[PDB]
Amino acid sequence: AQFQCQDDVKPTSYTTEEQKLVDQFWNESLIYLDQYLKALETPTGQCKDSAQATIQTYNSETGKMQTQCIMKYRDVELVAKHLKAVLAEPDKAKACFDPQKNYKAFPLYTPSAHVQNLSATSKWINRPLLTDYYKKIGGEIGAAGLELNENFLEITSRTDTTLHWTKDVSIKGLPTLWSSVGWIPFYAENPNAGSDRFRGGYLYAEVMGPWGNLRIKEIDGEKVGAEIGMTAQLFNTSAPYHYHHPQEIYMTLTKPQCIDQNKHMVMHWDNNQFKQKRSDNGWTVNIDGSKGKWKKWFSNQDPEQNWLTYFERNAIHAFHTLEGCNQTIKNSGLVTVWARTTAQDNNQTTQLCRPMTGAKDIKTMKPEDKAICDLDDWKP
Amino acid sequence: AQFQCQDDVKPTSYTTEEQKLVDQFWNESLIYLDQYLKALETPTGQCKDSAQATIQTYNSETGKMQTQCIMKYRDVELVAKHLKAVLAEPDKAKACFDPQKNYKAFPLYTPSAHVQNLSATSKWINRPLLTDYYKKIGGEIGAAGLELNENFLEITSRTDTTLHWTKDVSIKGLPTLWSSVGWIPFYAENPNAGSDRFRGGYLYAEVMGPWGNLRIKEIDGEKVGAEIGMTAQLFNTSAPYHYHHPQEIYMTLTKPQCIDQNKHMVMHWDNNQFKQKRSDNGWTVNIDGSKGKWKKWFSNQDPEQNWLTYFERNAIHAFHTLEGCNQTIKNSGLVTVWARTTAQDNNQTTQLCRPMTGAKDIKTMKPEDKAICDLDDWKP
Ligand SMILES: C[S+](C)(=O)CCC(=O)O
Ligand SMILES: C[S+](C)(=O)CCC(=O)O
Ligand SMILES: [Zn+2]
Ligand SMILES: [Zn+2]
């Protein structure tokens, strides 16, 4: 195969010792991507040829969850094809890999000195620390950011990978990877993202994709849409409803402490539980989960049975960690392997549904509050 | 100096070709022993006159590791004294060396044909192969033994000796030594030794000592206690707690792939973490590491910082390779330079702590399981 790297991949030269740190980063990245391929292709449930993914937590006509075998989607097929080419010619793909030590586009972080201490690679990369970031921010956002990042190892180690992975892909099994990838406080600066705790208590990182460590633009003339990484959301937080053009996959790693520790919702934009109105090149979708109506839209997540979910384009989705033992546990949360399949086409912006009532209660947004989602059409 | 060999050292005539093969073995043995001497005597840490050794991974009064400058121990001073005499008059000491080609006391092995082929000496010695030994045994012990011995060179080559050794003592630098010494599956036939994978996945060999290639009984009327060799323990294994009369020294060669790949515990018999009751001519020591209490007793091992440990008489110890990247790595383990200092006095038996109850299973013992150690007094 012929790899064309992204345009911000630059020639690099390392000392003998530095190259060992980069090679360990690369090797664990390759394990992550081989396990990712196996997670897609290994059959589960009643699917004969690939993994059974939840595509709607609540189908309006059936009143139950809806699944699909994940390799039925052409975009997922292409992700698998590109991972296979990467893994078959790793020396070629590695031309497109760098540790993002001097990445200028935007800041990338490491949670804490403790996390940094997990690997010589992470100490050498020397990203700014999120403990420093949230000390400067202060307030309730800073308190949530400190709770997550000062306890990041413990939160992210509460995982069970034994059923759907043949190698531990968590921070315990791949500590150089998790300690060295660029972590991003994606909601800390966004007032529309809801509560102070959710904004300070959310992080994600990208191993592979247009902004990750492995940045391949094309393989054999095909645009690489794969964007793979991880996410971490502190316990006792709720987020507003989300939607976006790119299709998205989540594999839950967290071993819950109670059955309803981690709940999630995904429903297609044209689901009859919502009200739709055509708009200039899009849809206005009204969501009304008031008076307990929201509860049936949310399903419990775990790393064995309800572990895999696939979001079609503009599907409405949310992650909810307020119920049950979230009111008593400590240093806990929701931790996933995350991906998007079409990162190089359409609009990648993560959109948030807004209060039907207005910016005023934007901070107290939960799944029971009536919301409005302004969807845009995508290009075929 | 005057050397008196052990009683099973016999005179043997060699052809010119055989003597050459014996000589190469002896020459690498002398390098191994000279490096051993330097590892004891070269100051490290805050020790001014000799190497800083860990003697307790967890002191109960301080809650921290405890160290000692290793030449403060009179038995270590005597190993150093006797190594110096060997190195000063190697022709005299060579009278007590033989390749154990026809050693009668018990079987000695070579891991595999591949390892055997690493040196003309080992091909000539023609030990029985552990690949053959474990094919016959079969089952889960045999599967572990084959995994270790089919991949012996890869496992034992994952070493970094640059910091504390001036010549590489690993298989990569002394291939005749490592391929020719007699390897022993010390736990393969011991039903008390714990899991089937630990039992098949353990090996040690003895260069110098009462059962080694160099078998000196006395130097200048002093009994030589020195017993020096190497150990290999396959990854993803744990062993029961150990104890024994002879003092013991471990120098870690494996370069870990995660900071917690290779963990060890050593705590003196009278450590207040345990409960002691005076028994007949000994001490009953009860150990309770349940509910995570064991974790603080175990320290990470590497060849640079926590590379040297010294076990006082009857000190409880264990080596634990279940954590972290042991759930992700392959063809890996823990490899050490091993020694005992008083191999000619008291009871040399390696003792194992047992499960607290009759219902408790040996095949599952891990550091977290309550255990009972029946210690015997030594002769002062
Ligand atoms: C925070 S991420 C990794 O951009 C994905 C968030 C989402 O849209 O679900
Ligand atoms: C003689 S052995 C097989 O090294 C005993 C192992 C130990 O007690 O550390
Ligand atoms: Zn999303
Ligand atoms: Zn021992």
Numbering used by the authors:
A (entry chain A), B (entry chain B): 22 to 401
What does the paper say about this structure?
Dimethylsulfoxonium propionate (DMSOP) is a recently identified and abundant marine organosulfur compound with roles in oxidative stress protection, global carbon and sulfur cycling and, as shown here, potentially in osmotolerance. Microbial DMSOP cleavage yields dimethyl sulfoxide, a ubiquitous marine metabolite, and acrylate, but the enzymes responsible, and their environmental importance, were unknown. Here we report DMSOP cleavage mechanisms in diverse heterotrophic bacteria, fungi and phototrophic algae not previously known to have this activity, and highlight the unappreciated importance of this process in marine sediment environments. These diverse organisms, including Roseobacter, SAR11 bacteria and Emiliania huxleyi, utilized their dimethylsulfoniopropionate lyase ‘Ddd’ or ‘Alma’ enzymes to cleave DMSOP via similar catalytic mechanisms to those for dimethylsulfoniopropionate. Like dddY, cloned dddL, dddQ, dddW, dddK and dddU conferred DMSOP lyase activity even with equimolar DMSP present, which was not surprising considering the similar structures of DMSP and DMSOP, and that these DMSP lyases have cupin domains and similar catalytic mechanisms.
Cloned dddY from A. faecalis and Acinetobacter bereziniae conferred DMSOP lyase activity to E. coli (424.2 ± 20.6 and 359.4 ± 18.0 pmol DMSO per mg protein per minute, respectively) and purified DddY proteins yielded DMSO and acrylate from DMSOP. In contrast, DddY, DddX, DddP, DddL and Alma were more efficient (3–13.3-fold) using DMSP than DMSOP, whereas DddK, DddQ and DddU were more efficient (2–83.4-fold) with DMSOP. Note, DddP, DddX, DddY and Alma proteins generated 1.4–5-fold more DMS than DMSO when incubated with equimolar DMSP and DMSOP levels, consistent with them having significant DMSOP lyase activity but preferring DMSP as a substrate. We also solved the crystal structure of the DddY–DMSOP complex and docked DMSOP into DddQ and DddP structures.
